[PDB]
Write a protein that binds this ligand. Structure first.
Ligand SMILES: [Mg+2]
Ligand SMILES: [Zn+2]
Ligand SMILES: [Zn+2]
Lengths: 107, 171, 51, 229, 97, 84, 58, 519, 168
RNA sequence: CAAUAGGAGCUUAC
DNA sequence: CCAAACACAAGTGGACCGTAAGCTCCTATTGCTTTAA
DNA sequence: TTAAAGCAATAGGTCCACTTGTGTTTGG
């Protein structure tokens, strides 16, 4: 994780994905001042494991492309270090049922 | 030549026939319907292996008409000729312009120009037949004859052979 | 006649003879050719100067 | 998982009030003589006092009620609102049960506490929005009916059932069976065109309608705008 | 003339879930038609002689794999106009992938 | 291949409104096409009402095949789904 | 919307239409996989074979 | 059942596969080559074969049959011809994509400007969607201005090394600017040269840009032979009992034929290069406006009445076009309309139907052994008395009209036959008021036959319809089968819509005098 | 009407000259693919039946359907009767008499023996059980494809075949 | 046993 | 500091605008030149 | 000298996408 201050230039930015097998993510300090997962409108995201993702797909008789989706650049996917194909589980308030579990897959 | 062929036949059933021994009625309908028919894509359907034990499955009611559709899948035996394949036969007819030989369910006729020239026809022999010195073609004979043509007509097909080639003709 | 498009339509109309007052009103009618292509509700409004 | 014609506004009774009011409505004590069931309502009144193998079940019930209170107050309805559209109307069920079985004359009730507790527990484990032995199926099923279970447990509490509604065993079995069947009737049917119904349900009110509101604001929302008025 | 069963009437029938009624309004109460398609090319280029019981797609040189379809006459006309603009709509009666 | 065994059938055990409507329509069309009638016909001559009597007595011989979004399906005879 | 442009793009890219929607089944006059058309109605044999043997096809 | 028997099995469309039509298949499916412009022979009775009204194209007359399929007007679909063009022309609906492909590919050797060597394109290839893949390859490959022969020892990728032009669009003419090395010589790209360049694209190259080998080949976006639609798509009409004008498409095809022949009068004799371009461009413009007469920045193909030509695109779009005017909604039989009135004495799910409408509309009731007496009474009653019947349908589709039949007493009804009896009490009918804003604006009612030509409604159902009785009219749709009767009565019936899902409250109440009176 | 596992065969842009039949050159048609399928779509080896297996199968099917018709209770001219229709009886009688006029293997025992011995392309596999041949010459000239496979073994296989051939 | 099309204009009920 | 590779912003494009219904009225190519009787 | 048939000829405001030009980074 490479926390920077002002900006990361695209020429530098292109080296970020070409450094396999390590992973480099960057955040700007101004963005990190508030932790957004503590916000009341942001429910708790929990990345699933591979076995649990397989269980989720089989329980619903689903393909990966038939799930609601989340961008890798989503602030909470960025905050969680989500890689492509990983599924978060989002438990949230429900005024009709009390509790509702949502799942989104990463683009 | 005979091939074992998996084939199907979609059917329509009136609601009036919806009784307790329906499936056997459809089996009898299949046996009457298919035992004898020709199709240009398969050949000739002589019999059906295990006729009484075909599975009709579950039919679906067509919306708007009320008649049932069945995909009665089964494995049967079909007989199809191919040009350039050798097929045995027995002669049925005789004529100055050639003779007819029954092949499988069909009857094959060979023309005069496609016959070894040592064979000579005779309208006056008893019995009337083609002859030669050391070759004979009379009624009841066997003929190992090649197929060199097959036109596909939906109901009845016809194959025209040629006995002009070696190892062929009277046997 | 050959320029029917780009020409004003409905400038002449069949005189309404259903009843007498309908005729009298048809003879005193007015039309602003703004057109219905456009949802500006301002020119459709009864205005003070209409008095 | 419910069809939108089948739900009616109902009060969730564990939400409102002070802790003292909550305690007085719902908490029972077996050893304590005064704060127990009023003796003149049940057949088995004298056998109740002093027991322990039943005060355990009463405490479990009260702790489940406190769990519901905390859940609804802190997660679901943080602002205190307790009148929400929900499936089967239980006031009407209770009043119909009173009418059919003639609950007058304040008769000695033959409805034991353990039977009440186990009846409500089984009912809470009988409301099927999703069927299957899978584990995500079980989790989704329990998340689906959490609010409705909160309602059913806030209403069918032991003190309330025995004192305020005075149901006997027959009325109790009838209320439970009716809750099963009417909840099974409140579910949306597979095949519903909920998208067309929702589109019409949203568009029709627009025909009757310095913050921007009404049709221009709805147009801004649906025509997702990078800037708004 | 007849009354227009417009788009909003179709929306209301869809909300009601009455699929058979919608199909019956749009087909048997209106321009229902029958066309023959080629089982190989899926174009309505099948030459049909119903009294002689003979069919042929001359492009595919086909006489056995031909299917009939009941479709709105307006749909047949739409497909023919698309063919007139070199677009080939191919109607297939079975899924492959 | 795509059929589901009668044990792991995870759909509702209750006949839905659309299934009931279509089943009644199809049965009415069948009886109106001189199909045999399983119930005892006492008074009524309308094929739809006869179909309703048969449906209530669980004597309508039809099957609902409930397709899942992935193409698989479950089979339920009408007589084993519960009608309200 | 954009009917002609969308049809041209579908032609130029060889789009395959799976015919699972509502409108697509509407324009072809077919039963939509919707409401009453979201299932199929088969013929049950186990219940049928209980009938009297005289109600049979001849 | 109103279709004569065909032996093929009837099935329904599960998959639609769009795509272009190749010239080979266009020639193959055709039935007659079209070359003579003039419509009639010489105004001479069964016009010139090889013209736009060749009987091979099909029949549009009631007492004549199709010379191609031998079927009546009812069954003959119409048959396509073809009309070879002297020069190839652009398909008007593909010029932007032709330009994009021209920018993407090497215009000399038919190869992609960049390979999988460059990892950006090596990953842009990896998109499954044809359109996203095409966009991701064009957004990169469009800027390299040479077909490098070496992939970035000397290893040759097979490239050529020719520079790339800067494509631009001005109307229907594709300009390509070659900036040599100063003066960039800008030349016109004709449809034929682009067609030749496009035929050279290899199958795998074709796959990378997102096209298809079997269905959509990039050169099939250039027209070289034109299909001629049957006269069904462009039928003639009669104005005053003896006169006929051809449809717009027919005159447009005639103009195209004139243009084609004028093109074939230039490459056969003197043509000083300022007539070849003019006449070929006339052909291009006629072909373009035959398909799309709404092209920006040019005049429209006009009629001698001053109106523009009704192009096919204009045929297909809009509220009144094919899709929304004939497919999303259409006019239907077995419907009625009249003013509505209120009746306090009707039940909630009852509608009062005028006698005249009850006799004009009809329901087909299959004859069975439970309704044969009643149906024979209806047949004897006739189509002028209620309850009667209008038609008898035999088991093969033959209609017995009971008006002109003088011997209505001598009809015995067979089993399985069908009688199209009158509208009768308790029939479920769909009843509807526009606009139909929600599912409860169109509901199924039970019929009660009444005099006095208005429709009668119980007054509590006027709220879901938003109706009142000061001029309103409402529509009535009669279901023509048992499936639709059951669907109406079990899903759309008035009692079933009392509670709405919009706000989980009732929509029908007590109104407008019963409320005041009950207070 | 009559269809089978052969389904779409959809139209690719290109055609194929290799579509005409020539039974001398192993070209049979797009109905006898080198790897067949079954009625469950599962893969399955092509079937090319000699006269013996087919005769046994047809006799078996006819007698099974006769026992089924009889409730559970000898000659081709009679055994072909089980079909329905005069044309059916005629075609099956001619086929069965053709089988019994050229059936060198008149039992299941020798059919099983040749099945074991043979199991190479099933076409020629069945044609060897169908076409009696003295030496290598008849096989390699009447069946011209045995040349370019370099696994012949025709000598001893044919020897044992004609040895197992019953008298007549 | 067979009753044109396209336009414009004025209106009806929301 | 002059060069290639590459990104962002601005301007000029296009497409669409409730539903259903009724009636009446007008127009459906016209004019000029050439050929044949 | 007149009539019929065929061919030719005129003068509303928003948003999104694509293309071109000018600025930034890395560096020969
Ligand atoms: Mg009104
Ligand atoms: Zn074809
Ligand atoms: Zn090149």
């Amino acid at each position: 994780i490479f926390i920077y201050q002002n900006n990361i230039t695209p020429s530098a930015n292109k080296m970020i994905p070409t450094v396999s097998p390590a992973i480099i993510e960057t955040f700007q300090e101004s963005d990190l001042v508030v932790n957004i997962t503590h916000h009341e409108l942001v429910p708790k995201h929990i990345r699933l494991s591979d076995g649990e993702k397989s269980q989720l797909l089989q329980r619903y008789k689903l393909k990966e492309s038939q799930l609601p989706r989340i961008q890798r650049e989503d602030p909470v996917a960025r905050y969680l270090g989500l890689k492509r194909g990983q599924v978060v589980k989002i438990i949230r308030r429900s005024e009709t049922s009390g509790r509702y579990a949502s799942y989104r897959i990463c683009l | 030549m005979f091939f074992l062929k998996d084939l199907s036949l979609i059917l329509t059933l009136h609601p009036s026939y919806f009784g307790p021994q329906m499936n056997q009625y459809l089996r009898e309908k299949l046996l009457t319907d298919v035992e004898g028919t020709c199709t240009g894509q398969f050949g000739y359907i002589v019999t059906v292996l295990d006729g009484m034990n075909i599975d009709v499955g579950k039919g679906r009611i067509i919306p708007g008409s009320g008649s049932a559709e069945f995909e009665v899948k089964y494995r049967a035996v079909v007989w199809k000729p191919f040009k350039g394949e050798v097929v045995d036969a027995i002669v049925s007819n005789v004529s100055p312009i050639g003779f007819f030989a029954d092949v499988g369910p069909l009857n094959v006729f060979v023309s005069t120009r496609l016959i070894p020239d040592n064979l000579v026809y005779n309208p006056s022999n008893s019995p009337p037949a083609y002859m030669s010195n050391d070759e004979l073609i009379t009624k009841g004979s066997k003929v190992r004859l090649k197929v060199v043509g097959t036109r596909t007509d939906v109901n009845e097909i016809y194959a025209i052979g040629s006995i002009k080639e070696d190892f062929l003709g009277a046997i | 006649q050959k320029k029917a498009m780009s020409s004003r339509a409905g400038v002449s109309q069949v005189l309404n003879r259903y009843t007498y007052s309908s005729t009298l009103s048809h003879l005193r009618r007015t039309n602003t050719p703004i057109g219905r292509d456009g949802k500006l509700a301002k020119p459709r409004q009864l205005h003070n100067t209409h008095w | 998982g419910l069809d939108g014609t089948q739900v009616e506004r109902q009060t969730i009774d564990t939400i409102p009030g002070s802790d003292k009011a909550f305690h007085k409505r719902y908490y029972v004590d077996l050893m304590d003589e005064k704060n127990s069931i009023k003796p003149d309502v049940i057949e088995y009144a004298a056998d109740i006092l002093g027991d322990v193998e039943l005060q355990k079940e009463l405490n479990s019930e009260y702790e489940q009620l406190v769990s519901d209170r905390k859940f609804l107050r802190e997660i679901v309805f943080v602002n205190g609102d307790h009148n929400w559209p929900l499936p089967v109307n239980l006031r009407r069920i209770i009043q119909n049960a009173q009418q059919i079985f003639h609950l007058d004359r304040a008769k000695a009730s033959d409805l034991t506490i353990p039977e009440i507790i186990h009846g409500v527990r089984d009912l809470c484990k009988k409301l099927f929005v999703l069927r299957g032995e899978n584990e995500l199926i079980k989790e989704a099923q329990q998340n689906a009916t959490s609010l409705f279970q909160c309602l059913v447990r806030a209403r069918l509490a032991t003190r309330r059932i025995l004192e305020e509604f005075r149901l006997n065993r027959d009325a109790f079995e009838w209320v439970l069976g009716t809750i099963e069947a009417q909840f099974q009737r409140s579910l949306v049917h597979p095949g519903e065109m909920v998208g067309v119904i929702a589109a019409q349900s949203i568009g029709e009110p627009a025909t009757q309608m310095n913050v921007t509101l009404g049709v221009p604001r709805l147009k801004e929302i649906l025509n997702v705008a990078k800037n708004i008025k | 003339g007849g009354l227009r069963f417009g788009e909003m009437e179709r929306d209301c029938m869809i909300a009601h879930g009455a699929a058979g009624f919608l199909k019956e309004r749009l087909m048997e109460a209106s321009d229902a038609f029958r066309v023959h398609v080629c089982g190989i090319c899926g174009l309505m280029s099948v030459i049909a002689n119903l009294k002689k019981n003979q069919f042929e797609c001359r492009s595919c040189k086909n006489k056995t794999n031909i299917y009939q379809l009941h479709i709105p006459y307006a749909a047949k006309l739409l497909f023919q106009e698309l063919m007139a603009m070199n677009i080939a709509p191919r109607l297939y009666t079975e899924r492959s992938g | 291949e795509l059929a589901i065994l009668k044990e792991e059938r995870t759909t509702t055990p209750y006949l839905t409104k659309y299934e009931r409507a279509r089943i009644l329509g199809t049965r009415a069309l069948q009886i109106s096409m001189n199909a045999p009638v399983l119930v005892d016909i006492e008074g009524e001559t309308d094929p739809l009402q006869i179909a309703m009597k048969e449906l209530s007595q669980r004597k309508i011989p039809l099957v609902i095949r409930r397709y899942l979004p992935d193409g698989s399906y479950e089979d339920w005879g009408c007589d084993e789904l519960i009608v309200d | 919307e954009e009917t002609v442009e969308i049809l041209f793009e579908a032609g130029a890219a060889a789009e395959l239409d799976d015919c699972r929607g509502v409108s697509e089944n509407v324009m072809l006059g077919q039963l939509a996989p919707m409401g009453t058309g979201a299932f199929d109605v088969m013929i049950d044999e186990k219940l049928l074979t209980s009938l009297p043997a005289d109600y049979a096809p001849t | 059942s109103q279709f004569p028997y065909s032996s093929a099995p009837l099935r329904s469309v599960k998959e639609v596969q769009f795509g272009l039509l190749s010239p080979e298949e266009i020639r193959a499916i055709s039935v007659v080559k079209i070359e003579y412009p003039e419509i009639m022979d010489e105004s001479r009775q069964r016009p010139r074969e090889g013209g736009l009204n060749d009987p091979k194209l099909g029949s549009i007359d009631r007492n004549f049959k199709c010379q191609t399929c031998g079927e009546g007007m009812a069954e003959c679909p119409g048959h396509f011809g073809h009309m070879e063009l002297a020069k190839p022309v652009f398909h008007i609906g593909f010029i932007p994509k032709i330009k994009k492909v021209c920018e993407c590919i090497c215009m000399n050797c038919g190869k992609l400007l960049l390979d999988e060597t460059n990892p950006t394109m090596a990953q842009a290839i990896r998109i499954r969607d044809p359109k996203k893949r095409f966009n991701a390859v064009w957004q990169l490959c469009k800027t390299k201005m040479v077909c490098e022969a070496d992939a970035p020892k000397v290893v040759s990728r097979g490239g050529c090394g020719n520079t790339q032009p800067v494509v631009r669009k001005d109307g229907m003419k594709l300009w390509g600017t070659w900036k040599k090395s100063a003066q960039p010589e800008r030349k016109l790209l004709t449809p034929g040269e682009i067609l030749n360049v496009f035929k050279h694209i290899s199958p795998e190259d074709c796959f990378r840009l997102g096209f298809n080998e079997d269905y959509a080949r990039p050169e099939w976006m250039i027209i070289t032979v034109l299909p001629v639609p049957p006269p069904q798509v462009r039928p003639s009409i009669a104005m005053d009992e003896t006169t006929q004008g051809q449809d717009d498409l027919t005159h447009k095809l005639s103009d195209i034929l004139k243009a084609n022949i004028n093109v074939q009068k230039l490459e056969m004799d003197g043509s000083p290069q300022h007539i070849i371009n003019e006449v070929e461009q006339l052909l291009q413009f006629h072909v373009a406006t035959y398909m799309d007469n709404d092209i920006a920045g040019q005049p429209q193909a006009l009629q001698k009445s001053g109106r523009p030509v009704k192009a096919i695109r204009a045929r297909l779009k809009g509220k009144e076009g094919r899709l929304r005017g004939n497919l999303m909604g259409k006019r239907v039989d077995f419907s009625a309309r009249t003013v509505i009135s209120g009746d306090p004495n009707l039940e909630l799910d009852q509608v009062g139907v005028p006698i005249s409408i009850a006799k004009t509309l009809s329901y087909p009731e299959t004859v069975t052994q439970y309704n044969i007496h009643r149906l024979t009474e209806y047949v004897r009653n006739g189509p002028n008395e209620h309850p009667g019947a209008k038609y008898v349908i035999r088991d093969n589709g033959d209609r017995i009209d009971l008006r002109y039949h003088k011997r209505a007493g001598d009809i015995v009804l067979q089993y399985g036959w069908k009688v199209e009896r009158h509208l009768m009490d308790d029939d479920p009918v769909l009843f509807n008021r526009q606009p139909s804003l929600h599912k409860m604006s169109m509901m199924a009612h039970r019929v009660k036959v009444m005099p006095y030509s208005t429709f009668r409604l119980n007054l509590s159902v006027t709220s879901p319809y938003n109706a009142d009785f000061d001029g309103d009219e409402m529509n009535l749709h009669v279901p023509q089968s048992e499936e639709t009767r059951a669907e109406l009565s079990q899903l759309c019936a008035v009692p079933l819509q009392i509670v709405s899902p919009q706000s989980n409250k009732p929509v029908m109440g007590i109104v407008q005098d019963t409320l005041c009176g009950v207070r | 009407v009559s269809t089978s596992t052969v389904g779409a065969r959809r139209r690719r842009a290109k055609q194929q000259v290799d579509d005409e039949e020539n039974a001398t050159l192993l070209r049979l048609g797009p109905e006898f693919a080198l790897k067949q399928y079954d009625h469950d779509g599962n893969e399955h080896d092509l079937i090319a039946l000699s006269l013996s297996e087919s005769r046994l199968l047809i006799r078996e099917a006819l007698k099974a359907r006769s026992r089924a018709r009889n409730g559970g209770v000898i000659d081709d001219d009679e055994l072909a009767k089980v079909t329905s229709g005069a044309v059916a009886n005629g075609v099956v009688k001619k086929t069965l008499d053709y089988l019994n006029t050229f059936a060198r293997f008149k039992d299941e025992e020798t059919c099983t023996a040749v099945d074991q011995l043979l199991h190479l392309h099933p076409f020629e596999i069945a044609q060897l059980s169908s076409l009696g041949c003295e030496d290598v010459d008849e096989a390699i000239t009447l069946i011209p494809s045995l040349a370019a496979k370099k696994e012949v073994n025709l000598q001893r296989i044919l020897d044992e075949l004609n040895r197992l051939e019953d008298p007549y």
